[PDB]
Amino acid sequence: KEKKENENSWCILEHNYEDIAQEFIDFIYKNPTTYHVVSFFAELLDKHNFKYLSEKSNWQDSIGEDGGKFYTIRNGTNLSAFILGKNWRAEKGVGVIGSHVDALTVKLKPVSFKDTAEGYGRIAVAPYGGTLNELWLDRDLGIGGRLLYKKKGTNEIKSALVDSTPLPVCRIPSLAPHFGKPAEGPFDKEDQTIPVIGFPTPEPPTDDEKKSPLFGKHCIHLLRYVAKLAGVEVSELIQMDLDLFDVQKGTIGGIGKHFLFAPRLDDRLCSFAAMIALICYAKDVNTEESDLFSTVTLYDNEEIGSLTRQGAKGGLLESVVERSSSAFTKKPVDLHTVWANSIILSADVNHLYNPNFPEVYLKNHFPVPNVGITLSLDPNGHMATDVVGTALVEELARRNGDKVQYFQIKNNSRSGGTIGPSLASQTGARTIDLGIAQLSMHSIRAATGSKDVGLGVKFFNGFFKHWRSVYDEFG
Amino acid sequence: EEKEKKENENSWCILEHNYEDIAQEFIDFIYKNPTTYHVVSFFAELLDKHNFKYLSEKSNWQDSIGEDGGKFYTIRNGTNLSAFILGKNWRAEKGVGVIGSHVDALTVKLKPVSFKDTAEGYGRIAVAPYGGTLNELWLDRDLGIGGRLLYKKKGTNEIKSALVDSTPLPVCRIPSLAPHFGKPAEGPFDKEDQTIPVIGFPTPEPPTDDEKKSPLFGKHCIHLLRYVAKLAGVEVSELIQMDLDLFDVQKGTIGGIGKHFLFAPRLDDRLCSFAAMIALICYAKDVNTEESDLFSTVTLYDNEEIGSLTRQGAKGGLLESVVERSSSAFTKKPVDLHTVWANSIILSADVNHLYNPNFPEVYLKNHFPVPNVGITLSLDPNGHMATDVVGTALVEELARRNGDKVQYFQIKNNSRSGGTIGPSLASQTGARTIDLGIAQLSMHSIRAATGSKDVGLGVKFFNGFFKHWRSVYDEFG
Amino acid sequence: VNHLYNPNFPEVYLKNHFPVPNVGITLSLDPNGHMATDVVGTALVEELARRNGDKVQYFQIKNNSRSGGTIGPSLASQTGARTIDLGIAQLSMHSIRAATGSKDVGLGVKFFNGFFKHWRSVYDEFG
Numbered sequence A: 001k002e003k004k005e006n007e008n009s010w011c012i013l014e015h016n017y018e019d020i021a022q023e024f025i026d027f028i029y030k031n032p033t034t035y036h037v038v039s040f041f042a043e044l045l046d047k048h049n050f051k052y053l054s055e056k057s058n059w060q061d062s063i064g065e066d067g068g069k070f071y072t073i074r075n076g077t078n079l080s081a082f083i084l085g086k087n088w089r090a091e092k093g094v095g096v097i098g099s100h101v102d103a104l105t106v107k108l109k110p111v112s113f114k115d116t117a118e119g120y121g122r123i124a125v126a127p128y129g130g131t132l133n134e135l136w137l138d139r140d141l142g143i144g145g146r147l148l149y150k151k152k153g154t155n156e157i158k159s160a161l162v163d164s165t166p167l168p169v170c171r172i173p174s175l176a177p178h179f180g181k182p183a184e185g186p187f188d189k190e191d192q193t194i195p196v197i198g199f200p201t202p203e204p205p206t207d208d209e210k211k212s213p214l215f216g217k218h219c220i221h222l223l224r225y226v227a228k229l230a231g232v233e234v235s236e237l238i239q240m241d242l243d244l245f246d247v248q249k250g251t252i253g254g255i256g257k258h259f260l261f262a263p264r265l266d267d268r269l270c271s272f273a274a275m276i277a278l279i280c281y282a283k284d285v286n287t288e289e290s291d292l293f294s295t296v297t298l299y300d301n302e303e304i305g306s307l308t309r310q311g312a313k314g315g316l317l318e319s320v321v322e323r324s325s326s327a328f329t330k331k332p333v334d335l336h337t338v339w340a341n342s343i344i345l346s347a348d349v350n351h352l353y354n355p356n357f358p359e360v361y362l363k364n365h366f367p368v369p370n371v372g373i374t375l376s377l378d379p380n381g382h383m384a385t386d387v388v389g390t391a392l393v394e395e396l397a398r399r400n401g402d403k404v405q406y407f408q409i410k411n412n413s414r415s416g417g418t419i420g421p422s423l424a425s426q427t428g429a430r431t432i433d434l435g436i437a438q439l440s441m442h443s444i445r446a447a448t449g450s451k452d453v454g455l456g457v458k459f460f461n462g463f464f465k466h467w468r469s470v471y472d473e474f475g
Numbered sequence B: 001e002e003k004e005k006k007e008n009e010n011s012w013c014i015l016e017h018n019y020e021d022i023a024q025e026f027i028d029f030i031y032k033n034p035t036t037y038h039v040v041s042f043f044a045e046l047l048d049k050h051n052f053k054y055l056s057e058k059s060n061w062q063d064s065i066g067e068d069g070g071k072f073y074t075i076r077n078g079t080n081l082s083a084f085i086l087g088k089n090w091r092a093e094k095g096v097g098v099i100g101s102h103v104d105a106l107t108v109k110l111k112p113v114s115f116k117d118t119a120e121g122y123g124r125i126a127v128a129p130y131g132g133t134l135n136e137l138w139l140d141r142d143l144g145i146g147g148r149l150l151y152k153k154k155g156t157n158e159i160k161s162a163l164v165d166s167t168p169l170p171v172c173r174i175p176s177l178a179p180h181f182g183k184p185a186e187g188p189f190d191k192e193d194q195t196i197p198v199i200g201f202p203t204p205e206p207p208t209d210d211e212k213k214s215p216l217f218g219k220h221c222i223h224l225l226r227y228v229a230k231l232a233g234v235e236v237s238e239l240i241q242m243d244l245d246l247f248d249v250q251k252g253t254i255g256g257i258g259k260h261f262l263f264a265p266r267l268d269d270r271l272c273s274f275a276a277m278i279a280l281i282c283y284a285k286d287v288n289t290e291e292s293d294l295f296s297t298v299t300l301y302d303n304e305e306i307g308s309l310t311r312q313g314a315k316g317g318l319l320e321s322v323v324e325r326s327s328s329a330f331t332k333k334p335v336d337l338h339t340v341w342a343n344s345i346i347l348s349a350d351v352n353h354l355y356n357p358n359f360p361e362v363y364l365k366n367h368f369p370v371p372n373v374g375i376t377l378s379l380d381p382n383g384h385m386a387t388d389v390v391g392t393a394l395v396e397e398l399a400r401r402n403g404d405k406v407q408y409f410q411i412k413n414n415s416r417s418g419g420t421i422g423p424s425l426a427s428q429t430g431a432r433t434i435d436l437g438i439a440q441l442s443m444h445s446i447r448a449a450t451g452s453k454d455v456g457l458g459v460k461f462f463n464g465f466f467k468h469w470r471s472v473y474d475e476f477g
Numbered sequence C: 001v002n003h004l005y006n007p008n009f010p011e012v013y014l015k016n017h018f019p020v021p022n023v024g025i026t027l028s029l030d031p032n033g034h035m036a037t038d039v040v041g042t043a044l045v046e047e048l049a050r051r052n053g054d055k056v057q058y059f060q061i062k063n064n065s066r067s068g069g070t071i072g073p074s075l076a077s078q079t080g081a082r083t084i085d086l087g088i089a090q091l092s093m094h095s096i097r098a099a100t101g102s103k104d105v106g107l108g109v110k111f112f113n114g115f116f117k118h119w120r121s122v123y124d125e126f127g
């Protein structure tokens, strides 16, 4: 009864879109940084019997003839989960959803220390992508991310995740418009959009605290705070990679509750939907009987162009498929044949029609809320989508009872790029760019349809179930 | 029971050095009372609980105030409130101790006709800015709806009003354009065509014959009228008119790594209004009006953000009216109001500007305040503030006596100043008027900041003002 | 090579994130992908330096400035391996005649020699 109720809410089997929307909101709120997001999905995969495999060891002794359910992680921010059926062969190919788990944020600088300014404590930070604009002003900002530490009297460097939520430790204060021209944006990202962390009154550093490699690089108040959050000493902190982020919890909104308002939708929205879809699909997959290879791979650094080891161009997908297939058959695998028979969904959020800016949306080529997944189409290589991929997705949706929408830019407009073209050329596999549409992409707080999380999960679940069968129609 | 009563006084009136509780009450106050109508209603109910008697403006007060004086208040337009305490031994020569503040805040109003046609299925509402809103700070914020409905129950000729509030439901949002689209996504944005709140995306009941009998049918979307009617507990047909705000529903919070800050919407000037009213109530607890020789008031105005020239603003004269009517009813003999006002002190209590360390070039050295220190005097030699040398000296003397700290704000010579009600009240009364307030960051933002101790420190200062202004002003004679 | 502080152009250098002459190797840090350096790489080099007796400096651009890109991101992407962008800092990069510290060549050799001797042992502490 409880297991049947959980399957209905998570996998939208009983037509319940409210619960999955709430779980997405909870997920975003409880996992503010990329590190937290990858850790969330790792814990989720563990609970559904996926086995963690380390990149640093050869997989031949871990994967055998029976295949199974597995995942791996690179850099703590790039994760690939996969299901390998016992009866898989090269000609079956791979069914891939590729998304990104990085989101626009603000990073503490390597030295965050700033002199007090008339008593005000501030921290030196840097934008990750196009942040530190007017939308980041006057927002409640928490602090969180990865601390590296070394326990006193040991040599090993370990990792801890920290999160100030619900405490907003800082805020970037707008200047009152009373002052005139100085209060008009845009504002200088180095000199003007600086987080204000406190205003301390009249303990100084102890001799132990000074033994920290981070002493002098960050304010002692800050060091003590993150040390307390992680349950370690200040002296033990060696380094850190911390974000500032909006601590305003997401919510269902609109007068008819048609919307979901939440931070960091790009692209944790599709990443969540694809991952939940994989878990739902995996519940009814017996890997002893399956002839398929399925994966969701989640990348870092897409917002800065994907050219890092943990981004799409770093090749985790390709490595996973090569290592899995070599261990699985213990014999030479034709990876060119594998990728020639594969489909990659490059699942990245696209743009909902904004009725206040009709002039930038292409007629007949914009999505609306609460309908279904949106294909991203572009004739100049910004998206990897082609005629066969469009037809495949439309065929798949007709079979599974999903609706499909279009996005394409106006000829006089401008397009962003996704990981899709990178994945397509790296593998040689047909790649389809699509995703869950949203308003206000790259704002500190964005919006999508309240049913779109659930509709997304339904479509991706349908993909894993039927992509192979549908693609065989084209052969 | 008795210990809880002592602990309650200690929290609200900061008698045990407890600044955290009063900071939370302020946050709760802002969150639960999003519109000017709610704020005045909150204070009206607070005043009732501490034995202030409501007096209608519409009737003469000669029968309601007698020789013993007492604790009273009145309301104009539901948005302009004056509470006062009149002593049995008050005379014209004692004057009046006034704190004047404003309860209006920058907001977004629904237009008289909010109805917009659906735009590719999107529901939107037609709105207008109240003061300098509908800018980039208003984009991508969770907006609730609330304010005053006017209604007429079926089978009656009584027009009555109800306050409504969607909180916690954000019914709409003003969506920014993604920067991917380029130049169209760069601000500033047109306040009529571009910053329009998106309220829904409905899917496929039509209006009934009874709903069509509403005066507001056709003026607002049927979904909206249904919603506000359900909140008010009335029928759509009964709705006569409405005056509704859009506002940030994000609840305020204590913040900063050492909890030195308070982040909240609509601080200008509900921050000083709250602190002054609580100070009045705290002071009032230990005042026997049968023995007191004082006349004390907090008067809260509307429309200060639009220049105060309305009947419910400072230029409408509620203060002057209250003092004239009360004193006439009190003595039942000729009161010389010119002597009254010549012996009075008016604190024009309005928030001023905390030093912002990221814009040092706009703050005057030695003339800016910092958080968690105390009240800030607003000084200006060109008439933007009413503060003069004697008023500065009075406040500094008051503070030294009561153990408060005082800060300064004045603009740089190459900068520009806001204007408060202070000059208006000074001119209208002829009384010495002192502009001061609790300083804040990001005034006119949708979400501002002040110090976490500053609510309590304001209450403390204003309480000392009521206790000691008369004695201190007597030093200057 | 990365950029030594030029005292005639203070306005383009980020406080606490510039190197000076004759101290040691300089880490190139950038949160927008111009360099491959990450938090673990930073900690590795600092650990390695502490063990070998080398000094480490930082370079990162101001938020309102501009960055060059190195081969680092390419090598990290092509291999999948953790990559650390660093170098010996110089003045007047891309001039026909540039400048560095007179000790910096030797200090560079000493640091790189320490890397080959000890990188495996130090990186094992992160495992």
Ligand SMILES: C[As](C)(=O)[O-]
Pocket: A181, A182, A183, A184, A185, A186, A187, A188
């Ligand atoms: C004119 As400015 C740099 O204060 O936005």
Ligand SMILES: C[As](C)(=O)[O-]
Pocket: A266, A267, A302, A303, A348, A416, A417, A418
């Ligand atoms: C670089 As993108 C398509 O995630 O805005």
Ligand SMILES: C[As](C)(=O)[O-]
Pocket: B183, B184, B185, B186, B187, B188, B189, B190
């Ligand atoms: C460039 As515009 C008028 O869309 O802010």
Ligand SMILES: C[As](C)(=O)[O-]
Pocket: B268, B269, B304, B305, B350, B418, B419, B420
């Ligand atoms: C017009 As004002 C002094 O309340 O910003």
Ligand SMILES: C[As](C)(=O)[O-]
Pocket: C068, C069, C070
């Ligand atoms: C392209 As370069 C970092 O060698 O100046």
Ligand SMILES: [Zn+2]
Pocket: A266, A303, A441, A442
């Ligand atoms: Zn993006």
Ligand SMILES: [Zn+2]
Pocket: A266, A267, A348, A349
């Ligand atoms: Zn994206």
Ligand SMILES: [Zn+2]
Pocket: B268, B305, B443, B444
């Ligand atoms: Zn104002």
Ligand SMILES: [Zn+2]
Pocket: B268, B269, B350, B351
């Ligand atoms: Zn004001």
